[PDB]
Design a protein around this nucleic acid. Structure first.
Lengths: 75, 389, 140
RNA sequence: UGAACAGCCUCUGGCCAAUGGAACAAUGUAGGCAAGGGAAGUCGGCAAAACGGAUCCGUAACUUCGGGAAAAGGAUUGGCU
RNA sequence: CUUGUGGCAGCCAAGCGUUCAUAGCGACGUUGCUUUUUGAUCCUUCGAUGUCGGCUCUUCCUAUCAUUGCGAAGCAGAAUUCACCAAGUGUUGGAUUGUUCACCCACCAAUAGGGAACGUGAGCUGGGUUUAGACCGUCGUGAGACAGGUUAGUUUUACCCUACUGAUGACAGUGUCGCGAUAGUAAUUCAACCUAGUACGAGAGGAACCGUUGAUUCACACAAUUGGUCAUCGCGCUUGGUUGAAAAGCCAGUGGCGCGAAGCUACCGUGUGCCGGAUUAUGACUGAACGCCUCUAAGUCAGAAUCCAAGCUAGCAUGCGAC
């Protein structure tokens, strides 16, 4: 598909060349934001795991769980 | 001076001075280059409807400034440019009052062409089977009339012109069904040959590829988007008057001087803005094509992957392109769903702007904001749907 | 009569968004002991009526030292803007902006007047002024 | 709710009469918001705007020792259990 | 009106300038022009022409600061200085003062000078001048005065007519496509690269032409992008209050907040902005007048940011053609 690209360091999405906004930080780090939604989160100090649109979330569930213990007078 | 010797250049051009409503919905170039070139394949203009705008990335090449070569983003206007039905060969003889038509020839078989044309051009939106155009002549009477014109043309050396009309009925997405009759000049060789060809040329369409060559600098002429009625500030580009508060903000202060008892034409005040005829010159025609049966699409992998030139979800307020397309450099005058005409550059010089072609890499036909690039990526989003999407 | 050229910078290569008018306070990104510069004028510009001269990344700028050590203080020296918080557009089409607005004080020879840079330097600045480039911790 | 006879919402009591309809253009009037910069605007920070309540910490040269003082400047503030 | 006073431009040429009156200047004088100083005047207006400055915007003027193209030089290069055609196009930001003016800082190709009811108040501001309050100093017995200072002090009305701006529009009817009369008219400036560490120069230094690329300022568009906007009250969040709760919502003159398409919009985003001719300045040709000789008398060539097309915008609604 696309062979020349950047990668959004927030929302994960491929950024086309001739697109996006790159924040140059004072410590010389580069952060790549696909669009204005992406960069607002960074400025506001959102962790991407903090359910932003749900960026670097997506983590596995498990199943249900037993009725055991958690204070119920057994030993 | 008289007062304050700190003076500014004048706001708003005097060559773009009457900012007022265009006479017709389609711009009409008032002169054309002179007949000096190839035979009546060379129409000097073609018409389309501005579809919207897209973007293309092209890999430059120059050396003067610091950075050069490598990819560059570019704006490009996409225009749907259907093949156009040339109706007639019209004989305009030059006079010392400027050109005068002697007669106009109309095709041998019009019965749908003039009937879609007719809610301006004439009037009434196809009701009871009416709005009348002349029906084709007696068989050998009408043919004789055409050849009588050939004699007149070939004795004074007529500047050959063509009446054509835009068949917008080949497009669907644009809600207008109404053909626009227009005059496009024919350029080429000797009078006898060009006229003879021109008779045969109304018995068949003319495509995009046959009027413009790729790379060419083409002046694009249209009528700007209508904005409505607008202030001084956005009509002439004057300053706001500056204060904390002030009984006029978006205003000019003084519109003359005491002794000439009359307001100048050059002073800036409000009025209509937009819907103005304008010419915007020297636009590189990057690509000409069409959906399926002209162009391929793209060449796969590095070149680019196949991407239809419409953005997914269609152009806002236009329709969806699924036909002819023409990539003309940068911005283009007009809104969307208005006639734009392309007419070859009068300054045939070129010189060095582009010169060399500059192979199409990316189209930016944007389907993004979290997804996109046709088919597979759209499928990925649809996977997170399915039974309510 | 004609003033003879050189000095004033050169023809940028892009059209750039003005971020710093006159009378702005702008960080000193070198270790002369100066720790605040004041942009007073722009070295190269031609302006017009009412409109404040404004400068941007890579431009040659005129500055006075507002605060720091008294040796630097209240002297007027040329400066080059190394960073500006207003976006710069590169040819490729990505927009690059910096965290802070900073300039360095520079010699009239275009060599640094400062011991070292701190923070990144724009590619644009390095091209125009190659002796800012050879003072650079980082070039982006 | 909250110090509140503050504001806001509501009870009780009282109106529904503020000519009505349509478009909702520029231009006004009245109300908001603006990236980056931050008074360079201007005779002048005019008002917009920001600060703001409180608890804790911290508090100046000076002074008629009473004050300045809520100086400045910071941090804190929920739901629920 | 006038032009003493002011400003600008000449004539003469004693001198200066190593030399050398006249590259550039120019005494003692002397002739003009202008109203860009201010008076003189009372012509006009006191049953009423709104003062000054600034803010803003225009047009014009040239005695042209720059740029275009040129002629001088005590122009080697180069700074620089002089003169010409020329208002085509620019001619700046701040600090302070009500001050325009002024005076600095700082940029620059350049930061020219003047006018338009001392341009510009039913466009503004109201800071100065110039009311009523008031303080101080001086003068005055006093009341008061002050070309002395200082502060606070109401800016009314356009809907009429024209101008201008845009909107429609009756001439067989109805309607098209054109033509293009006439009017308006646009691009500007700079640096880097190359030339070139070259020409030139003893060295120090140090070009331009041409070839190249972008910027600056202006103009004209457009929303791909990017940024801004939110009344999609679209979605989420949150507080107070209100539906007993649940759920789904209501009210806070748009409740507040984070986002937000579509639309609009930003040298706060992008892209684009034309070349032929006729000529000027000026250098020339041939060549008399003036046997020779001369850009000129006759004839004639090259030639400008000029001008006129080209081109671009109104489309003659009282021009017209074809259909």
């Amino acid at each position: 598909m696309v062979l020349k690209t950047e990668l959004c360091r927030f929302s994960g999405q491929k950024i086309y060349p001739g697109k996006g906004i790159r924040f140059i930080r004072a410590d010389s780090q580069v952060f790549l934001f696909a669009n204005s939604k992406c960069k607002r989160y960074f400025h506001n100090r959102l962790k991407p795991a903090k359910l932003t649109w749900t960026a670097m979330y997506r983590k596995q569930h498990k199943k249900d769980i037993h009725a055991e213990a958690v204070k119920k007078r057994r030993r | 001076m008289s007062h304050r010797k700190f003076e500014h250049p004048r706001h708003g051009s005097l060559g773009f001075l009457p900012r007022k409503r265009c006479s017709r919905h389609r711009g009409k170039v008032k002169s054309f280059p002179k007949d000096d070139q190839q035979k009546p394949c060379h129409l000097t203009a073609f018409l389309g409807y501005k579809a919207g705008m897209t973007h293309i990335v092209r890999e430059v090449e120059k050396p003067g400034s610091k950075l050069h070569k490598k990819e560059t983003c570019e704006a490009v206007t996409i225009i749907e440019t259907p093949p156009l039905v040339i109706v007639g060969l019209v004989a305009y003889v030059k006079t010392p009052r400027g050109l005068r038509t002697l007669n106009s020839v109309w095709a041998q078989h019009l019965s749908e062409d003039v009937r879609r044309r007719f809610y301006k051009n004439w009037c009434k939106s196809k009701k009871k089977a009416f709005t009348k155009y002349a029906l084709k002549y007696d068989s050998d009477a009408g043919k004789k009339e055409i050849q009588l014109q050939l004699e007149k043309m070939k004795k004074y050396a007529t500047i050959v012109r063509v009446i054509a009309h835009t068949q917008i009925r080949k497009m669907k997405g644009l809600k207008q069904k109404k053909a626009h009759l227009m005059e496009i000049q024919v350029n080429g060789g000797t009078i006898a040959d060009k006229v003879d060809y021109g008779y045969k040329f109304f018995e068949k369409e003319v495509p995009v590829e046959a009027v413009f060559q790729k790379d060419e600098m083409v002046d694009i002429i249209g009528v700007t988007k209508g904005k409505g009625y607008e202030g001084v500030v956005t009509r002439w580009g004057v300053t706001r008057l500056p204060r904390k508060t002030h009984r006029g903000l978006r205003k000019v202060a003084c519109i003359g001087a005491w002794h000439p008892a009359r307001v100048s034409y050059t002073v800036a005040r409000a009025g209509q803005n937009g819907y103005h005829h304008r010419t915007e010159m020297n636009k590189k025609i990057y690509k000409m094509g069409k959906s399926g049966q002209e162009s391929h699409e793209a060449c796969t992998e590095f070149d680019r992957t196949e991407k239809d030139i419409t953005p997914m979800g269609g152009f806002p307020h236009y329709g969806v392109v699924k036909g002819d397309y023409l990539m003309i450099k940068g911005c283009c005058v007009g809104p969307k769903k208005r006639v734009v005409t392309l007419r070859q550059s009068l300054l045939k010089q070129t010189s060095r702007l582009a010169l060399e072609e500059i192979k199409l890499k990316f189209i930016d036909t944007s389907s993004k904001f979290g997804h996109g690039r046709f088919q597979t990526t759209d499928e990925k989003q649809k996977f997170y749907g399915r039974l309510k999407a | 009569m004609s003033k003879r050229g050189r000095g004033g910078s050169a023809g940028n290569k892009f059209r750039m968004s003005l971020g710093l008018p006159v009378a702005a306070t702008v960080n000193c990104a070198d270790n002369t002991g100066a720790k605040n510069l004041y942009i007073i004028s722009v070295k190269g510009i031609k302006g017009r009526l009412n409109r404040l001269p404004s400068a941007c990344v890579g431009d040659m700028v005129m500055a006075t030292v507002k605060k720091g050590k008294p040796d630097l203080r209240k002297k007027v020296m040329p400066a080059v803007i190394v960073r500006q918080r207003k976006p710069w557009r590169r040819k490729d089409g990505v927009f690059m902006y910096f965290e802070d607005n900073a300039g360095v004080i520079v010699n009239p020879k275009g060599e640094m007047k400062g011991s070292a840079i701190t923070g990144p330097i724009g590619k644009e600045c390095a091209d125009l002024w190659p002796r800012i480039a050879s003072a650079a911790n980082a070039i982006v």
